[PDB]
Amino acid sequence: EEEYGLVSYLDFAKLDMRVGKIIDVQDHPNADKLYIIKVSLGNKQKTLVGGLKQYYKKEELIGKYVVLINNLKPKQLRGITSEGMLLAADDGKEVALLMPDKPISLGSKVR
Amino acid sequence: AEEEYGLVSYLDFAKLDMRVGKIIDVQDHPNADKLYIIKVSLGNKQKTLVGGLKQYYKKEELIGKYVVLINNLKPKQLRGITSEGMLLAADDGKEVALLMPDKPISLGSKVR
């Protein structure tokens, strides 16, 4: 992949990246490639739309520890409000959601 | 654009080049007793990082670990050693958990 121009640490600092846990996954009722994903941050939950249906079955996602951007502005995706986004690596062959390497408290901040 | 205060757009994330890498070497920082010098492979380039992981991970447990690197940060000199990036880790104040892809995907894979 291509090398990017350099940015400030302060640009990374703008993101509120957190560990969450997937609680429920359903097909997006109007978009065949998308899931509606309910993520727990502990005492809060967020509902996101993710383009993961081609890569993960719904039962492979339940209980998964994931990483989300927690201060993303909400967006309407074909009738569903998405409150954030999950992070996943992609090399064109596979898509790999990011995870902490240990169970850690939900809502933990990534830094 | 209109001020958004504490909220970000996708473009604020897209500014950051986040990659999967693999740790290929870990050494003690010669001027800082809590820090490691960590060499991370992106496949056909490597980056040298300084990480405060010595209190949480043994060197031999980091070798071969698939990690998540911010790959386009400005460099930073930490007590004589230039760090070229940073690894992402979850921290709840009790425990530190490096992020990893959930499978050993190709080195240099970009996060989206």
Side-chain angles (χ1 to χ4, degrees), chain A residues 1-7 14-15 19 56 64 69 71-73 88-91 94-99 101-105 108-111, chain B residues 4 6-8 15-16 19-20 47 57 65 71-74 88-92 95-100 102-103 105-106 109-112:
Chain A
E1 292 261 29
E2 270 314 288
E3 288 285 309
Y4 281 51
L6 303 182
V7 302
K14 288 179 190 171
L15 308 185
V19 175
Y56 291 84
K64 204 160 176 63
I69 300 180
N71 61 332
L72 206 59
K73 53 213 290 192
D90 181 1
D91 63 5
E94 327 172 63
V95 163
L97 287 159
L98 304 190
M99 66 188 277
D101 70 1
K102 292 183 281 296
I104 191 165
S105 75
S108 291
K109 196 154 168 63
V110 176
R111 41 73 158 180
Chain B
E4 294 291 348
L7 293 165
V8 298
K15 303 191 202 116
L16 295 165
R19 305 290 195 80
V20 172
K47 301 248 167 143
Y57 289 86
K65 201 168 181 59
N71 193 42
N72 69 325
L73 290 185
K74 292 148 112 185
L88 301 186
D91 186 340
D92 60 7
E95 175 216 291
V96 170
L98 283 168
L99 299 190
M100 59 185 22
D102 72 354
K103 317 163 208 56
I105 196 162
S106 78
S109 290
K110 187 163 173 67
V111 176
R112 60 179 185 93

Short mmCIF file of all heavy atoms in Angstrom, two decimals, chain A residues 1-7 14-15 19 56 64 69 71-73 88-91 94-99 101-105 108-111, chain B residues 4 6-8 15-16 19-20 47 57 65 71-74 88-92 95-100 102-103 105-106 109-112:
data_model
loop_
_atom_site.label_atom_id
_atom_site.label_comp_id
_atom_site.label_asym_id
_atom_site.label_seq_id
_atom_site.Cartn_x
_atom_site.Cartn_y
_atom_site.Cartn_z
N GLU A 1 0.83 -1.20 0.00
CA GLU A 1 0.00 0.00 0.00
C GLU A 1 0.87 1.25 0.00
O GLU A 1 2.05 1.20 0.35
CB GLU A 1 -0.94 0.02 1.20
CG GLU A 1 -2.02 -1.05 1.17
CD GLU A 1 -3.36 -0.52 0.67
OE1 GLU A 1 -3.36 0.44 -0.15
OE2 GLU A 1 -4.41 -1.06 1.10
N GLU A 2 0.26 2.36 -0.38
CA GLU A 2 1.00 3.58 -0.63
C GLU A 2 1.32 4.28 0.69
O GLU A 2 0.56 4.17 1.66
CB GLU A 2 0.21 4.49 -1.57
CG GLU A 2 0.51 4.24 -3.01
CD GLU A 2 1.99 4.13 -3.27
OE1 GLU A 2 2.70 5.17 -3.22
OE2 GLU A 2 2.48 3.00 -3.47
N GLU A 3 2.46 4.95 0.75
CA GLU A 3 2.87 5.68 1.95
C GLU A 3 2.26 7.07 1.94
O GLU A 3 2.27 7.76 0.92
CB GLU A 3 4.39 5.78 2.05
CG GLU A 3 5.10 4.46 2.40
CD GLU A 3 4.95 4.08 3.86
OE1 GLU A 3 5.24 4.94 4.73
OE2 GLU A 3 4.55 2.93 4.15
N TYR A 4 1.76 7.49 3.10
CA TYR A 4 1.02 8.73 3.26
C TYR A 4 1.91 9.85 3.75
O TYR A 4 2.95 9.63 4.39
CB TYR A 4 -0.13 8.54 4.25
CG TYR A 4 -1.35 7.85 3.68
CD1 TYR A 4 -1.24 6.64 3.01
CD2 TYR A 4 -2.61 8.38 3.87
CE1 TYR A 4 -2.37 6.00 2.50
CE2 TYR A 4 -3.74 7.75 3.37
CZ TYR A 4 -3.61 6.56 2.69
OH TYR A 4 -4.74 5.95 2.20
N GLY A 5 1.50 11.08 3.44
CA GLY A 5 2.09 12.23 4.10
C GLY A 5 1.89 12.18 5.60
O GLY A 5 0.94 11.58 6.10
N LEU A 6 2.83 12.78 6.33
CA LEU A 6 2.81 12.67 7.79
C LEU A 6 1.84 13.65 8.41
O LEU A 6 1.69 14.78 7.94
CB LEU A 6 4.20 12.92 8.36
CG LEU A 6 5.30 12.01 7.82
CD1 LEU A 6 6.62 12.33 8.52
CD2 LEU A 6 4.91 10.54 8.01
N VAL A 7 1.18 13.22 9.49
CA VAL A 7 0.24 14.06 10.21
C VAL A 7 0.65 14.08 11.68
O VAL A 7 1.50 13.31 12.12
CB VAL A 7 -1.22 13.60 10.07
CG1 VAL A 7 -1.64 13.56 8.60
CG2 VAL A 7 -1.41 12.24 10.73
N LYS A 14 -7.80 13.17 17.89
CA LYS A 14 -9.18 13.60 17.66
C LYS A 14 -10.16 12.44 17.74
O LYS A 14 -11.35 12.67 18.01
CB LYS A 14 -9.30 14.27 16.29
CG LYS A 14 -8.67 15.65 16.20
CD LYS A 14 -8.85 16.20 14.78
CE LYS A 14 -8.03 17.46 14.57
NZ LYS A 14 -8.04 17.86 13.14
N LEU A 15 -9.70 11.22 17.48
CA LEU A 15 -10.58 10.05 17.47
C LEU A 15 -10.79 9.52 18.88
O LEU A 15 -9.85 9.45 19.67
CB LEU A 15 -9.97 8.93 16.63
CG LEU A 15 -9.53 9.29 15.21
CD1 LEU A 15 -9.07 8.03 14.48
CD2 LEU A 15 -10.63 9.99 14.45
N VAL A 19 -12.75 -0.07 22.87
CA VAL A 19 -13.12 -1.48 22.77
C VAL A 19 -14.61 -1.63 23.04
O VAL A 19 -15.14 -1.10 24.03
CB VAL A 19 -12.30 -2.33 23.74
CG1 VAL A 19 -12.77 -3.78 23.72
CG2 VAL A 19 -10.84 -2.25 23.38
N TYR A 56 -18.21 -12.19 7.22
CA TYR A 56 -18.52 -12.81 8.50
C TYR A 56 -19.98 -13.23 8.51
O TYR A 56 -20.85 -12.43 8.15
CB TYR A 56 -18.29 -11.86 9.67
CG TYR A 56 -16.85 -11.49 9.98
CD1 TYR A 56 -16.21 -10.47 9.28
CD2 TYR A 56 -16.17 -12.12 11.00
CE1 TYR A 56 -14.90 -10.11 9.58
CE2 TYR A 56 -14.86 -11.77 11.31
CZ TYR A 56 -14.23 -10.76 10.60
OH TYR A 56 -12.94 -10.41 10.91
N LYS A 64 -18.07 -10.92 19.77
CA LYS A 64 -16.75 -10.50 19.33
C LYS A 64 -16.35 -9.20 20.01
O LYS A 64 -17.15 -8.27 20.13
CB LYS A 64 -16.76 -10.32 17.82
CG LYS A 64 -15.43 -10.43 17.15
CD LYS A 64 -15.65 -10.72 15.68
CE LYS A 64 -14.34 -10.74 14.94
NZ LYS A 64 -13.42 -11.83 15.41
N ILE A 69 -14.83 3.59 16.41
CA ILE A 69 -14.70 5.02 16.60
C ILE A 69 -16.00 5.49 17.23
O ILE A 69 -17.08 5.28 16.67
CB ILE A 69 -14.42 5.74 15.28
CG1 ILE A 69 -13.12 5.21 14.65
CG2 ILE A 69 -14.33 7.24 15.51
CD1 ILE A 69 -12.77 5.88 13.33
N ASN A 71 -16.85 8.63 18.52
CA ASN A 71 -17.28 10.02 18.38
C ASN A 71 -17.49 10.39 16.92
O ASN A 71 -17.28 11.53 16.51
CB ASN A 71 -16.30 10.97 19.05
CG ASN A 71 -14.91 10.90 18.45
OD1 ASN A 71 -14.49 9.87 17.93
ND2 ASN A 71 -14.18 12.01 18.52
N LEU A 72 -17.94 9.43 16.12
CA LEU A 72 -18.26 9.69 14.73
C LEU A 72 -19.64 10.33 14.63
O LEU A 72 -20.56 9.96 15.37
CB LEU A 72 -18.22 8.39 13.93
CG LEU A 72 -17.91 8.46 12.44
CD1 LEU A 72 -16.56 9.10 12.22
CD2 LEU A 72 -17.95 7.06 11.84
N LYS A 73 -19.78 11.30 13.74
CA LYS A 73 -21.10 11.88 13.53
C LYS A 73 -22.03 10.82 12.92
O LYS A 73 -21.59 10.04 12.07
CB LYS A 73 -21.03 13.11 12.63
CG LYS A 73 -20.31 12.90 11.31
CD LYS A 73 -19.57 14.18 10.89
CE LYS A 73 -20.52 15.28 10.47
NZ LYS A 73 -19.81 16.40 9.79
N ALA A 88 -11.34 -2.53 10.68
CA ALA A 88 -10.97 -3.83 10.13
C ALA A 88 -9.88 -3.65 9.08
O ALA A 88 -9.97 -2.76 8.24
CB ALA A 88 -12.19 -4.53 9.52
N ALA A 89 -8.86 -4.50 9.15
CA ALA A 89 -7.85 -4.58 8.11
C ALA A 89 -8.38 -5.34 6.89
O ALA A 89 -9.19 -6.26 7.01
CB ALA A 89 -6.59 -5.27 8.62
N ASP A 90 -7.88 -4.97 5.72
CA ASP A 90 -8.35 -5.53 4.46
C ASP A 90 -7.19 -5.56 3.48
O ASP A 90 -6.57 -4.52 3.24
CB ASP A 90 -9.51 -4.69 3.91
CG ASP A 90 -10.08 -5.23 2.60
OD1 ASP A 90 -9.60 -6.26 2.09
OD2 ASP A 90 -11.04 -4.61 2.10
N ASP A 91 -6.88 -6.73 2.94
CA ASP A 91 -5.84 -6.86 1.93
C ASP A 91 -6.39 -7.30 0.57
O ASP A 91 -5.60 -7.68 -0.30
CB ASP A 91 -4.74 -7.82 2.39
CG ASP A 91 -5.23 -9.25 2.61
OD1 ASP A 91 -6.41 -9.57 2.32
OD2 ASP A 91 -4.41 -10.07 3.07
N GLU A 94 -8.75 -11.08 2.49
CA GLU A 94 -9.55 -11.24 3.69
C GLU A 94 -9.79 -9.88 4.32
O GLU A 94 -9.08 -8.90 4.05
CB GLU A 94 -8.88 -12.14 4.73
CG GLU A 94 -8.04 -13.27 4.20
CD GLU A 94 -7.29 -13.94 5.32
OE1 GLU A 94 -7.97 -14.49 6.21
OE2 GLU A 94 -6.04 -13.89 5.34
N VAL A 95 -10.81 -9.84 5.17
CA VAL A 95 -11.10 -8.71 6.04
C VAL A 95 -10.98 -9.21 7.48
O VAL A 95 -11.58 -10.24 7.83
CB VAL A 95 -12.49 -8.12 5.76
CG1 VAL A 95 -12.94 -7.24 6.91
CG2 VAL A 95 -12.44 -7.33 4.47
N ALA A 96 -10.20 -8.51 8.29
CA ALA A 96 -9.95 -8.92 9.67
C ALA A 96 -10.30 -7.77 10.59
O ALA A 96 -9.57 -6.78 10.65
CB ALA A 96 -8.48 -9.32 9.86
N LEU A 97 -11.42 -7.89 11.31
CA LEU A 97 -11.73 -6.93 12.36
C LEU A 97 -10.60 -6.86 13.38
O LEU A 97 -9.95 -7.86 13.70
CB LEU A 97 -13.03 -7.32 13.07
CG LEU A 97 -14.33 -7.09 12.30
CD1 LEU A 97 -15.43 -7.96 12.89
CD2 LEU A 97 -14.74 -5.60 12.35
N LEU A 98 -10.37 -5.66 13.88
CA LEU A 98 -9.40 -5.48 14.96
C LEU A 98 -10.01 -5.87 16.30
O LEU A 98 -11.22 -5.76 16.52
CB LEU A 98 -8.92 -4.03 15.01
CG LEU A 98 -8.30 -3.45 13.74
CD1 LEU A 98 -7.66 -2.10 14.06
CD2 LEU A 98 -7.31 -4.42 13.10
N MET A 99 -9.15 -6.32 17.21
CA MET A 99 -9.59 -6.75 18.53
C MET A 99 -8.47 -6.50 19.53
O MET A 99 -7.29 -6.48 19.14
CB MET A 99 -9.95 -8.24 18.52
CG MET A 99 -8.76 -9.14 18.26
SD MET A 99 -9.28 -10.84 18.03
CE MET A 99 -9.42 -11.36 19.73
N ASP A 101 -5.96 -7.96 22.36
CA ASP A 101 -5.40 -9.31 22.42
C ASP A 101 -5.79 -10.06 23.68
O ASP A 101 -5.34 -11.19 23.89
CB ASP A 101 -3.86 -9.28 22.28
CG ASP A 101 -3.13 -8.69 23.49
OD1 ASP A 101 -3.74 -8.30 24.50
OD2 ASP A 101 -1.87 -8.63 23.42
N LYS A 102 -6.61 -9.45 24.53
CA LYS A 102 -7.11 -10.02 25.77
C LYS A 102 -8.51 -9.49 25.96
O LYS A 102 -8.82 -8.38 25.50
CB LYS A 102 -6.27 -9.63 26.99
CG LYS A 102 -4.88 -10.20 27.02
CD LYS A 102 -4.17 -9.80 28.31
CE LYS A 102 -3.63 -8.37 28.23
NZ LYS A 102 -2.59 -8.22 27.18
N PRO A 103 -9.38 -10.24 26.63
CA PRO A 103 -10.61 -9.63 27.14
C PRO A 103 -10.20 -8.50 28.06
O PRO A 103 -9.36 -8.66 28.96
CB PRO A 103 -11.31 -10.78 27.89
CG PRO A 103 -10.69 -12.02 27.37
CD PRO A 103 -9.28 -11.67 27.00
N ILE A 104 -10.72 -7.31 27.77
CA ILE A 104 -10.47 -6.12 28.57
C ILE A 104 -11.82 -5.44 28.73
O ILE A 104 -12.76 -5.69 27.97
CB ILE A 104 -9.42 -5.20 27.90
CG1 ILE A 104 -8.97 -4.09 28.85
CG2 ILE A 104 -9.95 -4.63 26.59
CD1 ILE A 104 -7.69 -3.38 28.38
N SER A 105 -11.93 -4.62 29.78
CA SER A 105 -13.21 -4.02 30.10
C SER A 105 -13.80 -3.31 28.89
O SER A 105 -13.09 -2.61 28.16
CB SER A 105 -13.07 -3.05 31.28
OG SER A 105 -12.45 -1.86 30.86
N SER A 108 -13.00 0.37 27.12
CA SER A 108 -11.61 0.79 27.31
C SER A 108 -11.16 1.67 26.15
O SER A 108 -11.49 1.41 24.99
CB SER A 108 -10.68 -0.42 27.40
OG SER A 108 -10.87 -1.14 28.60
N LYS A 109 -10.41 2.72 26.47
CA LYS A 109 -9.95 3.63 25.43
C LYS A 109 -8.72 3.05 24.75
O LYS A 109 -7.87 2.43 25.40
CB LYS A 109 -9.64 5.01 26.01
CG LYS A 109 -9.52 6.12 24.95
CD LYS A 109 -9.85 7.49 25.52
CE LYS A 109 -9.45 8.61 24.55
NZ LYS A 109 -10.20 8.56 23.26
N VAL A 110 -8.64 3.21 23.43
CA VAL A 110 -7.47 2.82 22.66
C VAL A 110 -6.57 4.04 22.52
O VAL A 110 -7.04 5.14 22.20
CB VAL A 110 -7.87 2.28 21.28
CG1 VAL A 110 -6.62 1.96 20.46
CG2 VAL A 110 -8.74 1.05 21.44
N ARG A 111 -5.29 3.86 22.80
CA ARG A 111 -4.35 4.94 22.65
C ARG A 111 -3.06 4.39 22.08
O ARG A 111 -2.99 3.18 21.81
CB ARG A 111 -4.12 5.64 24.00
CG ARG A 111 -3.99 4.71 25.21
CD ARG A 111 -2.67 3.96 25.23
NE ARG A 111 -2.30 3.49 26.57
CZ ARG A 111 -1.19 2.81 26.84
NH1 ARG A 111 -0.33 2.54 25.86
NH2 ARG A 111 -0.92 2.42 28.07
N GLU B 4 -17.66 21.11 14.40
CA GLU B 4 -18.34 19.91 14.86
C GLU B 4 -18.02 19.55 16.31
O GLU B 4 -18.54 18.54 16.81
CB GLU B 4 -18.00 18.71 13.96
CG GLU B 4 -18.52 18.82 12.51
CD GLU B 4 -20.04 18.73 12.38
OE1 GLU B 4 -20.72 18.35 13.36
OE2 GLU B 4 -20.56 19.04 11.29
N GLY B 6 -16.84 17.98 19.54
CA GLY B 6 -16.18 16.73 19.86
C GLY B 6 -16.35 15.59 18.88
O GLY B 6 -15.81 14.51 19.12
N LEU B 7 -17.06 15.79 17.77
CA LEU B 7 -17.38 14.71 16.84
C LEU B 7 -16.51 14.79 15.60
O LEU B 7 -16.07 15.87 15.19
CB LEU B 7 -18.85 14.77 16.41
CG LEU B 7 -19.88 14.48 17.50
CD1 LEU B 7 -21.27 14.91 17.03
CD2 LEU B 7 -19.88 13.01 17.86
N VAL B 8 -16.28 13.64 14.98
CA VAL B 8 -15.40 13.56 13.82
C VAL B 8 -16.16 12.96 12.64
O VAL B 8 -17.18 12.29 12.80
CB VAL B 8 -14.13 12.74 14.11
CG1 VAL B 8 -13.33 13.39 15.22
CG2 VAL B 8 -14.50 11.33 14.49
N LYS B 15 -7.38 10.36 7.37
CA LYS B 15 -6.09 11.03 7.44
C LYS B 15 -5.01 10.12 8.01
O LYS B 15 -3.81 10.36 7.80
CB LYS B 15 -6.14 12.27 8.36
CG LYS B 15 -7.12 13.40 8.10
CD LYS B 15 -6.73 14.58 9.02
CE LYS B 15 -7.87 15.58 9.29
NZ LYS B 15 -8.31 15.66 10.75
N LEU B 16 -5.40 9.14 8.80
CA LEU B 16 -4.48 8.27 9.52
C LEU B 16 -4.25 7.00 8.74
O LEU B 16 -5.21 6.30 8.38
CB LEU B 16 -5.03 7.96 10.91
CG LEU B 16 -5.15 9.19 11.80
CD1 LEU B 16 -6.02 8.87 13.00
CD2 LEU B 16 -3.76 9.65 12.24
N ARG B 19 -2.06 0.45 9.76
CA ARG B 19 -1.65 -0.76 9.07
C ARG B 19 -1.49 -1.90 10.06
O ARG B 19 -1.13 -1.69 11.22
CB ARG B 19 -0.32 -0.56 8.35
CG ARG B 19 -0.32 0.59 7.40
CD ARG B 19 -1.19 0.31 6.19
NE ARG B 19 -0.89 1.27 5.14
CZ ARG B 19 0.16 1.16 4.33
NH1 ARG B 19 0.97 0.12 4.42
NH2 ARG B 19 0.38 2.09 3.41
N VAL B 20 -1.68 -3.13 9.56
CA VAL B 20 -1.24 -4.31 10.29
C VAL B 20 0.25 -4.50 10.04
O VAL B 20 0.71 -4.47 8.88
CB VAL B 20 -2.02 -5.56 9.85
CG1 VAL B 20 -1.42 -6.83 10.47
CG2 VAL B 20 -3.47 -5.40 10.24
N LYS B 47 9.55 -0.31 10.30
CA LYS B 47 9.53 0.92 11.07
C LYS B 47 10.07 0.63 12.46
O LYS B 47 9.86 -0.45 13.01
CB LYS B 47 8.13 1.49 11.18
CG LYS B 47 7.50 1.80 9.84
CD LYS B 47 7.35 3.29 9.65
CE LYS B 47 7.02 3.62 8.21
NZ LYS B 47 6.07 4.76 8.14
N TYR B 57 4.50 -6.56 28.80
CA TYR B 57 4.77 -7.68 27.90
C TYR B 57 6.24 -8.05 27.97
O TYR B 57 7.11 -7.17 27.95
CB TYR B 57 4.46 -7.34 26.43
CG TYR B 57 3.00 -7.20 26.08
CD1 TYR B 57 2.34 -6.00 26.25
CD2 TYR B 57 2.30 -8.27 25.53
CE1 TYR B 57 1.00 -5.87 25.92
CE2 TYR B 57 0.95 -8.14 25.19
CZ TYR B 57 0.32 -6.93 25.38
OH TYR B 57 -1.02 -6.77 25.05
N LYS B 65 4.24 -11.03 17.06
CA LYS B 65 2.88 -10.58 17.31
C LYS B 65 2.39 -9.71 16.15
O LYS B 65 3.12 -8.83 15.67
CB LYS B 65 2.85 -9.79 18.62
CG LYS B 65 1.51 -9.65 19.29
CD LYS B 65 1.74 -9.11 20.70
CE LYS B 65 0.45 -8.95 21.46
NZ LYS B 65 -0.29 -10.23 21.59
N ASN B 71 0.96 4.64 10.82
CA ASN B 71 2.10 4.55 9.92
C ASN B 71 2.48 5.88 9.29
O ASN B 71 3.45 5.93 8.53
CB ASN B 71 1.77 3.52 8.82
CG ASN B 71 2.97 3.12 8.01
OD1 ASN B 71 4.06 2.90 8.55
ND2 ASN B 71 2.79 3.02 6.68
N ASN B 72 1.77 6.97 9.60
CA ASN B 72 2.10 8.27 9.01
C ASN B 72 2.07 9.36 10.07
O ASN B 72 1.64 10.49 9.81
CB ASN B 72 1.17 8.63 7.86
CG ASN B 72 -0.25 8.92 8.32
OD1 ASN B 72 -0.76 8.29 9.26
ND2 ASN B 72 -0.91 9.86 7.64
N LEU B 73 2.54 9.04 11.27
CA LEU B 73 2.74 10.07 12.28
C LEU B 73 4.10 10.73 12.09
O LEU B 73 5.06 10.10 11.66
CB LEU B 73 2.67 9.48 13.69
CG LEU B 73 1.32 9.01 14.19
CD1 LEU B 73 1.47 8.59 15.63
CD2 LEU B 73 0.30 10.11 14.04
N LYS B 74 4.17 12.01 12.42
CA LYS B 74 5.47 12.67 12.49
C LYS B 74 6.36 11.95 13.50
O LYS B 74 5.88 11.50 14.55
CB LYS B 74 5.33 14.13 12.89
CG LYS B 74 4.67 15.00 11.83
CD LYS B 74 3.87 16.13 12.47
CE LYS B 74 4.49 17.48 12.20
NZ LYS B 74 3.79 18.59 12.93
N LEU B 88 -1.20 0.65 18.54
CA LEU B 88 -2.44 0.88 19.26
C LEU B 88 -2.64 -0.19 20.33
O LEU B 88 -2.41 -1.38 20.08
CB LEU B 88 -3.63 0.87 18.30
CG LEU B 88 -3.58 1.89 17.17
CD1 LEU B 88 -4.89 1.86 16.37
CD2 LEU B 88 -3.31 3.29 17.71
N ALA B 89 -3.11 0.24 21.50
CA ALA B 89 -3.39 -0.69 22.59
C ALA B 89 -4.58 -0.16 23.37
O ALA B 89 -4.72 1.05 23.55
CB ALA B 89 -2.19 -0.87 23.52
N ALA B 90 -5.42 -1.08 23.82
CA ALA B 90 -6.50 -0.77 24.75
C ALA B 90 -5.95 -0.72 26.17
O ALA B 90 -5.08 -1.50 26.54
CB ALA B 90 -7.60 -1.83 24.65
N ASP B 91 -6.47 0.21 26.96
CA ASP B 91 -5.99 0.45 28.32
C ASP B 91 -7.19 0.83 29.17
O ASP B 91 -7.85 1.83 28.87
CB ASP B 91 -4.94 1.58 28.31
CG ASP B 91 -4.27 1.80 29.66
OD1 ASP B 91 -4.83 1.38 30.70
OD2 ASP B 91 -3.17 2.40 29.67
N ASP B 92 -7.48 0.06 30.21
CA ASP B 92 -8.55 0.41 31.13
C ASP B 92 -8.04 0.90 32.48
O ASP B 92 -8.83 1.03 33.42
CB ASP B 92 -9.51 -0.77 31.33
CG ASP B 92 -8.83 -2.01 31.90
OD1 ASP B 92 -7.65 -1.94 32.26
OD2 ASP B 92 -9.51 -3.06 31.98
N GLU B 95 -5.11 -2.77 32.96
CA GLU B 95 -4.56 -3.75 32.04
C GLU B 95 -4.35 -3.08 30.68
O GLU B 95 -5.08 -2.16 30.31
CB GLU B 95 -5.50 -4.95 31.94
CG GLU B 95 -5.13 -6.01 30.94
CD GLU B 95 -6.36 -6.61 30.28
OE1 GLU B 95 -7.12 -7.34 30.97
OE2 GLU B 95 -6.56 -6.36 29.07
N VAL B 96 -3.34 -3.56 29.95
CA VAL B 96 -2.99 -3.05 28.63
C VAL B 96 -3.07 -4.19 27.63
O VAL B 96 -2.40 -5.21 27.80
CB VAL B 96 -1.59 -2.41 28.60
CG1 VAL B 96 -1.17 -2.13 27.17
CG2 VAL B 96 -1.56 -1.14 29.43
N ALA B 97 -3.87 -4.01 26.58
CA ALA B 97 -4.09 -5.04 25.57
C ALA B 97 -3.79 -4.46 24.20
O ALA B 97 -4.60 -3.69 23.67
CB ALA B 97 -5.52 -5.57 25.63
N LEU B 98 -2.65 -4.83 23.62
CA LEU B 98 -2.35 -4.44 22.24
C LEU B 98 -3.47 -4.89 21.31
O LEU B 98 -4.02 -5.98 21.46
CB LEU B 98 -1.04 -5.07 21.77
CG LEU B 98 0.26 -4.43 22.26
CD1 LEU B 98 1.43 -5.35 21.95
CD2 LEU B 98 0.42 -3.07 21.58
N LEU B 99 -3.79 -4.04 20.33
CA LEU B 99 -4.73 -4.43 19.28
C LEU B 99 -4.06 -5.38 18.30
O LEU B 99 -2.85 -5.34 18.08
CB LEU B 99 -5.26 -3.22 18.53
CG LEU B 99 -6.05 -2.18 19.33
CD1 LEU B 99 -6.73 -1.18 18.39
CD2 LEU B 99 -7.06 -2.87 20.23
N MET B 100 -4.87 -6.24 17.71
CA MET B 100 -4.39 -7.18 16.71
C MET B 100 -5.51 -7.40 15.71
O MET B 100 -6.68 -7.29 16.08
CB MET B 100 -4.00 -8.51 17.34
CG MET B 100 -5.18 -9.17 18.06
SD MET B 100 -4.70 -10.66 18.93
CE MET B 100 -2.93 -10.34 19.12
N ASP B 102 -7.93 -9.97 13.82
CA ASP B 102 -8.46 -11.21 14.39
C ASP B 102 -7.97 -12.44 13.63
O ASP B 102 -8.30 -13.56 14.03
CB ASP B 102 -10.00 -11.16 14.46
CG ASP B 102 -10.70 -11.26 13.10
OD1 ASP B 102 -10.03 -11.24 12.06
OD2 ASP B 102 -11.96 -11.32 13.08
N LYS B 103 -7.24 -12.25 12.54
CA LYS B 103 -6.54 -13.27 11.78
C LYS B 103 -5.22 -12.69 11.31
O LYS B 103 -5.09 -11.47 11.16
CB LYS B 103 -7.30 -13.74 10.54
CG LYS B 103 -8.77 -13.98 10.65
CD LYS B 103 -9.28 -14.01 9.23
CE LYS B 103 -10.70 -13.57 9.13
NZ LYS B 103 -10.93 -12.23 9.70
N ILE B 105 -3.53 -11.57 8.77
CA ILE B 105 -3.70 -10.99 7.44
C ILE B 105 -2.36 -10.45 6.94
O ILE B 105 -1.41 -10.33 7.71
CB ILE B 105 -4.79 -9.90 7.52
CG1 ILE B 105 -5.32 -9.50 6.14
CG2 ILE B 105 -4.28 -8.71 8.32
CD1 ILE B 105 -6.65 -8.75 6.22
N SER B 106 -2.28 -10.13 5.65
CA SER B 106 -0.99 -9.80 5.05
C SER B 106 -0.38 -8.57 5.72
O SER B 106 -1.08 -7.64 6.12
CB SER B 106 -1.17 -9.56 3.55
OG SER B 106 -1.71 -8.28 3.30
N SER B 109 -1.33 -4.60 5.52
CA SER B 109 -2.75 -4.43 5.26
C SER B 109 -3.27 -3.16 5.90
O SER B 109 -2.96 -2.86 7.05
CB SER B 109 -3.54 -5.63 5.80
OG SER B 109 -3.31 -6.80 5.05
N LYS B 110 -4.10 -2.42 5.16
CA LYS B 110 -4.60 -1.13 5.63
C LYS B 110 -5.93 -1.31 6.36
O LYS B 110 -6.77 -2.12 5.97
CB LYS B 110 -4.76 -0.15 4.48
CG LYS B 110 -5.12 1.27 4.92
CD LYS B 110 -4.87 2.28 3.81
CE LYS B 110 -5.38 3.66 4.19
NZ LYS B 110 -4.61 4.26 5.31
N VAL B 111 -6.10 -0.55 7.43
CA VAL B 111 -7.32 -0.57 8.23
C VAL B 111 -8.31 0.40 7.62
O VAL B 111 -7.96 1.53 7.26
CB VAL B 111 -7.01 -0.24 9.70
CG1 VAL B 111 -8.29 -0.16 10.52
CG2 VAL B 111 -6.06 -1.29 10.28
N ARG B 112 -9.55 -0.06 7.46
CA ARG B 112 -10.64 0.79 6.99
C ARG B 112 -11.86 0.63 7.89
O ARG B 112 -11.86 -0.16 8.85
CB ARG B 112 -10.99 0.45 5.54
CG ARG B 112 -11.45 -0.99 5.33
CD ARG B 112 -11.81 -1.23 3.87
NE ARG B 112 -12.37 -2.56 3.64
CZ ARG B 112 -13.68 -2.84 3.65
NH1 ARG B 112 -14.56 -1.88 3.88
NH2 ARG B 112 -14.10 -4.08 3.43
#
